[PDB]
From a paper:
In the Src_Abl chimeras, introducing the residues of Abl SH3 into the RT and n-Src loops barely changes the stability of the protein in the presence of GdnHCl. Comparison with the monomeric structure of the WT protein shows a low r.m.s.d. value (0.70 Å). Interestingly, although the replaced residues were those in the RT loop, the main differences are found in the conformation of the n-Src loop, which shows a different conformation from that found in the c-Src SH3 domain, as well as in Abl. Introducing the Abl residues into the n-Src loop of the c-Src SH3 domain does not increase hydrogen-bond formation, as happens in the monomeric structures of Src_Abl-nSrc and Src_Abl-RT. Additionally, while maintaining the hydrogen bond between Glu106 and Ser123, the distal loop exhibits diverse conformations in the c-Src SH3 domain. As shown in Fig. 8(a), the two chimeras that form an intertwined dimer exhibit the highest B factor in the distal loop. We do not have the structure of the monomer of Src_Abl-2, but the monomeric structure of Src_Abl-RT exhibits the same behaviour in the distal loop. As this loop is critical to the folding of the SH3 domain, this feature may explain why the opening of the folded domain is facilitated in these chimeras.
Residue numbers in the entry: 85 to 140
């Protein structure tokens, strides 16, 4: 479980928007730049920038 450090607005069809403070479950971290995540706060799924979140 990770927490969002900053708001992120999705710019494409596979990334996930989230608000600062949202809690997320990381599903796929094979790549170092983009992680597939699942929002525990909102239940939505998509790719997020890995440097927008921190473990919590």
């Amino acid at each position: 479980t990770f927490v969002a450090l900053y708001d992120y607005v999705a710019s494409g069809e596979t990334d996930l928007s989230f608000k600062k403070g949202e809690r997320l479950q990381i599903v796929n971290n094979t790549e170092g730049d983009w992680w597939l995540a699942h929002s525990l706060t909102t239940g939505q799924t998509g790719y997020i920038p890995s440097n927008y979140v921190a473990p919590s």
